[PDB]
Amino acid sequence: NYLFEYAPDVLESFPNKHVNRDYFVKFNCPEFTSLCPKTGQPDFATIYISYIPDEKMVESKSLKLYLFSFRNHGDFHQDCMNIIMNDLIELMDPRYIEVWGKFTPRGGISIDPYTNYGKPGTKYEKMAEYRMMNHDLYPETIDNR
Amino acid sequence: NYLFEYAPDVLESFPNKHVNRDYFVKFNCPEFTSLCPKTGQPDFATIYISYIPDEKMVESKSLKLYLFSFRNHGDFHQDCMNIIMNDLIELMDPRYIEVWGKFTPRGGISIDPYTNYGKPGTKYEKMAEYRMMNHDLYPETIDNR
Amino acid sequence: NYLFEYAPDVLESFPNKHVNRDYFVKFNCPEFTSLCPKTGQPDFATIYISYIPDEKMVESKSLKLYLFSFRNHGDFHQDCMNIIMNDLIELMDPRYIEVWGKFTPRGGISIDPYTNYGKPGTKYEKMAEYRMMNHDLYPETIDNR
Amino acid sequence: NYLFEYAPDVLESFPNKHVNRDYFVKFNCPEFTSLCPKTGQPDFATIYISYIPDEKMVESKSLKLYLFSFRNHGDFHQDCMNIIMNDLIELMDPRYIEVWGKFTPRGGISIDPYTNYGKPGTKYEKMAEYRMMNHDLYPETIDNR
Amino acid sequence: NYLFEYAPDVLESFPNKHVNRDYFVKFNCPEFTSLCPKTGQPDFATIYISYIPDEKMVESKSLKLYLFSFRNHGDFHQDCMNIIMNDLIELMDPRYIEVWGKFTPRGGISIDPYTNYGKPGTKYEKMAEYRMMNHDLYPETIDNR
Amino acid sequence: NYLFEYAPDVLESFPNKHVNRDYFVKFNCPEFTSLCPKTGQPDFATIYISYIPDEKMVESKSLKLYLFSFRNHGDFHQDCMNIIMNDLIELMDPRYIEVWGKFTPRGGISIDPYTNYGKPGTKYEKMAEYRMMNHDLYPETIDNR
Amino acid sequence: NYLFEYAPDVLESFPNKHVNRDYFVKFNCPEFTSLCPKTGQPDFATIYISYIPDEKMVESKSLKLYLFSFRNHGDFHQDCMNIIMNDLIELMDPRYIEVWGKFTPRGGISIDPYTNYGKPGTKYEKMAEYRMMNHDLYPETIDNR
Amino acid sequence: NYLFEYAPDVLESFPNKHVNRDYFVKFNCPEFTSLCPKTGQPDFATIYISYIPDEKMVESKSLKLYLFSFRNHGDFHQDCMNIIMNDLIELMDPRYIEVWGKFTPRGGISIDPYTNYGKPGTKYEKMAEYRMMNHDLYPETIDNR
Amino acid sequence: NYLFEYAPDVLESFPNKHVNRDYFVKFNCPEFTSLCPKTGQPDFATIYISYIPDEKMVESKSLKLYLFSFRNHGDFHQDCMNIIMNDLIELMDPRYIEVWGKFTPRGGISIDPYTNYGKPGTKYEKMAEYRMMNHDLYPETIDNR
Amino acid sequence: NYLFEYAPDVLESFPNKHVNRDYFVKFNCPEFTSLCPKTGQPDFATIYISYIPDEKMVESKSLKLYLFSFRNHGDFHQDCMNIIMNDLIELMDPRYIEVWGKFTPRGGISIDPYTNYGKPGTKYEKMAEYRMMNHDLYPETIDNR
Ligand SMILES: [Mg+2]
Ligand SMILES: [Mg+2]
Ligand SMILES: [Mg+2]
Ligand SMILES: [Mg+2]
Ligand SMILES: [Mg+2]
Ligand SMILES: [Mg+2]
Ligand SMILES: [Mg+2]
Ligand SMILES: [Mg+2]
Ligand SMILES: [Mg+2]
Ligand SMILES: [Mg+2]
Ligand SMILES: [Mg+2]
Ligand SMILES: [Mg+2]
Ligand SMILES: [Mg+2]
Ligand SMILES: [Mg+2]
């Protein structure tokens, strides 16, 4: 249940009507916040999630609810971007996926974590390998303002 | 008859005068809107369409109209970015094409779908794969404003 | 007890050391979120709070907490910008205060409420009227991204 | 009915819980488009609507529906920003109101119309007089891109 | 005529049907070019024309053409901002009008001329004086790039 | 000649005193305008001409005059960006050259054409090929404003 | 002295050779840092010090050293922006002076303090008063990034 | 003269075609450098020159040259901005003038001087007093980069 | 210690529990300051530290402090970017690490040093070489402001 | 020397503390001007100098001075950027170097030259070839202002 606790169950998929090709979908998510930090102070991020579906696409409404479920969730065991990628992998079995998060600063320093994944043994694994090697080569200017 | 209905047949091509080279043509299209969402609310987006003509070039006034024709159309037999690319592939049989959407937020999230295509087994297919691999590698700051 | 419930009583003031002058203090607050909307979806906003202390100054760590305390609070007996100003007027009895919200879109529209206050019949009241008259005169480009 | 035709009737108000003070509310509306032009080509705008309520506030959902009702409305008799201001005056009887619209260019030129209003004989009329005299003194840079 | 020379004759007006109030119209014209310099080489500017009609509006196609008409016009004895103003004042007999030009560099120097006009002995004559006195108080950053 | 019509003969070169390196030269050209469009209305664009000379360099002043010459020219029996790249190939015989145009919108759509050329059978052709497969991968944001 | 602690005695003046005009001088100071916060962690700010001299001008190099001296100083038994304005009043006896600070965030909130001073009973006090009633009316957008 | 020293004698003027109104001319001058610093080391600014003409207007080429003449000029007993305003005052006997410099950092700090002048006893003197009061109320964010 | 001197000892690590994949972490540190210049005066930069942990993550409070520790530290015989890298390499034994500094102007010149590191004989050694070769291909605009 | 002529002799170098890795040093140089144009008239650029050192690193003050020395220097038979690269090549025997100029408009056009160099036969030469291929693929929007 999405309201008070983390709800990976709230995620819903639908058939990708274009298995025939590589359809690339990105979700800009700037209303992300959670109690993942070890300190209990909330954190705040814009999370960008990009993926190439195989059989399945994720419903955008369910994603929103899913991300809201993190709001008051301070049972952080494994790292939060990963939880997000894992859950979405479990859901769609995608060809490619990545979760990029840009955080508000805490202590004068903002953390931008990044993970991706492509199906083992396919060009999508080369894609993840390539998008890692090339990650964030050209950084937006940060002045804390 | 026209200004309401989806109208893939108002499109028009004309002959490419530089078939010897790869001429790159980008259409920036910030005035795009449709009912494609299942809900019934309309959507809004900047659509970027880049192609390399072979023999036939799409004429811009007709692309304007084609695009306006999505105003009141909203069917999901198929996805709208793909509908757009297909009608364009049908019309032109181009070396390379891509359709990139940047949409306004609903529920806090914005969706930026992207599909491309290149003539099978040609260098253009290699370009499609490559452009997909490097797609949106340096995303834009999206704060909802 | 605290991190869920609306908590106007965690606020704390301390004595102004420059009561002789008009000291202007602006708090930029981009990490704000609440359930104030009647629907139940949360809202997000940058809140700008500007005041001129009289005898009492609000201490920032407590304002941080006060503001976090709206996370799960969402009641509309009264509006949230006004709730915020009132608790602050209660706490400090300041010469001048204003609370300016810039919110994220829902249904395509974004709402930027603004209220101010100045001690009745003083120059500060004149400043309130004036600032309201010149409010947001040079708006910002809002394209939803 | 909002779907196919103009629906000023769709607008709904609720009691302003703060008649006691001047509460300033602004709506950034970038998903505006209509068939108001004399040519039948649609037009596209970001519309900023700001107001100070008296007895009444406008419901934001109804506004959105109201603005959508312009989408396919080519019965343009009187100018479109005015229609919008008038309808909203009829609805709320506000202390102050203004409608500012920034249009996409047509013919290499973009039109930014502006009207406002304050209750006759009050400081709000002086406010409108002042916000007119001062309108758009510092223009954002336009290069059509 | 406007095809290859200065063409006041192409300017056209229509009745302003929102005459019992102050309707502010800005035209952003970033496609302006002429041979106004005495050097015989063209110049380039964005031109901002803002006015408040009395009884008549400028028909904007006609203003597209009128401006176009300046393309191959070697300087009148007058200056081009003022001729633009005069011709518009003749056509319309407006309450208030201004014309502001931002030209591109020559010699490393860009020139921004500004003239206005409020109907003599009205409040708009006071506005003119006001907008003159406040002109460009907050100027854009020029790096020549 | 160089006042009212297309003048390729205005172009002029001078010896590249550095035939031993790849010297990469870029001209940014914001003041470009022509009558190329079929219709006969002007277009407007920033045109970017990057290139690597072999023995010859184009003398900047003549490129200015050359581009000026497009002002009253609309022989779109070829395409204008290709005509430009061509006359420059004819004048220079360069290792590498490209012509990227960014046009202002028309019918709400703005067109950005791009063509290049690297000396055949050399690494420059590899370059033209690569830069074409990488073209405009990280697009500028377009809203028409 | 001027290496590890507060050093007002580093400040230095020189005759204003223009006592006959109002010469308005602004120092932009981005490299400001101190231990002012109660807690003992550093703060960081761009500090803007604008002022109109009477007979004395502050010698820029000494202001650099003066501000440098805050690096290891946290005697918030006064406020640091006021200490700065004060030592400068003490050193200069200026017609007008202000000190606007913009600090990086802490606990997700960034503080911007502002104080000014105009010679009492003169027009400068009118100025201090006006600029204070107009302070930061057109705010910079804050997202923490 | 021009080439290698301070040269006020190089400024021309020409007749103001529009004495019956207030014609505002701004010059944006980003290529300014000199040896005015006490040190001997050069400085670099954008100087913004604005004025309303009475009967004489400054010749635009002379200004470029005049300004070039500061390139190796060191010190009089005056600040460089005032030297500029004085010279321009003598040349044209202007109704209003102002010189606004924005310089590049030295020692972590950039200096922004500003002077102006209205004809004594006129509304122009009221304008100058006004524009000094309103000066640089909304500064750009400075970060040194 | 970190209070007033260089403090590697404060750096702290923890087990990376997402070890069977590549997790990319960027720290934006825009509050960096030290006495690394041999001139004895401080310097100021944003520092971007990006790494891909093997088995251990840097604990980020400890990195806040470590960086803080540089505040009053007159240059090691080494250079400060590399010492930052080494110490982090010692603490963590990472697959990949880079440290990029953007310093503020001195002499009118800002220095951006960049070093990286991929574990010897792994793919990350190839990445290092790659990110080196591609470093800063698309550099930010420096106006010194 | 420095003061009034071209002075290569003014460049120092000092030992590279890090020969065992690739240490990338970028200089951002926005205060560059010279008389290199054929005309005799000056020019203004931001020059960006980047290099990987072998055994010598350039002394940062000498570079400022060296660069100042171009202030009144006219023409050799070389372009100015190459003169800079050559001088820096001689001084340090670098692994990689590149000079990127961005100049201000003359005649509606700004020129952006670029050269580089890797040690012949090394991976650095591969890097230089690579960086020329990838050069300025994503240009900033140029409008002359
Ligand atoms: Mg499958
Ligand atoms: Mg920033
Ligand atoms: Mg074929
Ligand atoms: Mg934003
Ligand atoms: Mg009291
Ligand atoms: Mg935007
Ligand atoms: Mg009432
Ligand atoms: Mg623009
Ligand atoms: Mg610019
Ligand atoms: Mg030809
Ligand atoms: Mg735009
Ligand atoms: Mg004191
Ligand atoms: Mg920001
Ligand atoms: Mg800047």
Numbering used by the authors:
A (entry chain D), B (entry chain E), C (entry chain E), D (entry chain D), E (entry chain C), F (entry chain A), ...: 20 to 164
List passages from the publication reporting this PDB structure.
QueF is the nicotinamide adenine dinucleotide phosphate (NADPH)-dependent nitrile reductase that functions in the biosynthetic pathway of the tRNA-modified nucleoside queuosine (Q,), a 7-deazaguanosine nucleoside found at the wobble position of bacterial and eukaryotic tRNAs possessing the GUN anticodon (those encoding for Tyr, His, Asp and Asn). QueF catalyzes the NADPH-dependent 4-electron reduction of the nitrile group of the pathway intermediate 7-cyano-7-deazaguanine (preQ0) to 7-aminomethyl-7-deazaguanine (preQ1), the last intermediate in the tRNA-independent portion of the pathway. QueF belongs to the tunnelling fold (T-fold) structural superfamily of purine/pterin binding proteins. B. subtilis QueF, a ~160 amino acid protein with a single T-fold domain, is a homodecamer of two head-to-head facing pentamers, each composed of a cyclic arrangement of monomeric T-fold subunits, forming a tunnel in the center.
